[PDB]
Amino acid sequence: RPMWYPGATAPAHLDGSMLGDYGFDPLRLGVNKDNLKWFREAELTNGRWAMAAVVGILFTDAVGLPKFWTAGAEKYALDNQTLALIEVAVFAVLEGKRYEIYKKTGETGFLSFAPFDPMGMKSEEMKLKELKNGRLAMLAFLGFCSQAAVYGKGPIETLQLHLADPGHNNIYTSSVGPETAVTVAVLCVLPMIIEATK
């Protein structure tokens, strides 16, 4: 059972019953058993949202459509006032039906279908793959927003620019260079800090 660094120790409440366990809880926010399930469901839905959002942002830059941070300013074939009213009206019923699913079963669902799987490949390994991909997509979305904050342009453009000069084009040579360098050094020292005390 690999941990979040070579030589970690579970904080007595992450024994491994949950999928994708690595003993990562320094703030100990999952000390409560009741909060662990809710936080897990929140992590799963945040991961699903980030997965769909990252795939959508990556697809818009390939075709040539407007950037993800400027797509809202574009004029569509509707009114923004009516869009917000419809969005909160549909999501009220959708989120209400999803919340009642978690109280009866404990996982996500769509509308009145708690185990929503028309094809049927709901396996234990598939649940962990969803969590891993969701975590990766959450970091990817944070990276997309951060790259657009300092460099702008776009994710695909950022990757293309990094290949031109990898030794000179990175987060360390950008406007947030020293902060991230100090943070990387502090993070690299952190496992030794935890292992020195234990």
Ligand X SMILES: CCCCCCCCCCCCO[C@@H]1O[C@H](CO)[C@@H](O[C@H]2O[C@H](CO)[C@@H](O)[C@H](O)[C@H]2O)[C@H](O)[C@H]1O
Q: Which stretch in 40-48, 53-61, 96-104, 164-172 sits in contact with other proteins by CB under 8 A? A: 164-172
- Residues 53/139, Cβ–Cβ less than 8 Å: no
* 1, 2, 6, 72: which one binds other proteins (CB under 8 A): 6
Question: What is the C-alpha to C-alpha distance for residues 137 and 123, in angstroms, rounded to an integer?
Answer: 21
Q: How far is CA 97 from CA 31, 35, 113, in A?
A: 28, 21, 9
The reply to whether 77 sits near other proteins by the rule CB under 8 A is no
> Shortest distance, CB of residue 152 to other proteins, whole angstroms?
13
The reply to whether 188 sits near ligand X by the rule CB under 6 A is no
Query: Which candidate, 140, 117, 141, places its Cα nearest to that of 127?
Result: 117
Dihedral of CA atoms 122, 126, 131, 135 in degrees, nearest 10, equals -130
Question: What is the C-alpha to C-alpha distance for residues 52 and 43, in angstroms, rounded to an integer?
Answer: 14
Contact residues for ligand X, defined by CB under 6 A? 189, 192-193, 196
Binding region for all-trans-violaxanthin: 25, 27, 68
Binding region: 4, 22-25, 27, 30, 38, 40, 43, 46, 48-49, 68, 78, 87, 95, 98, 116, 122, 129-130, 132-133, 135, 146-147, 151, 162, 170-171, 179, 188
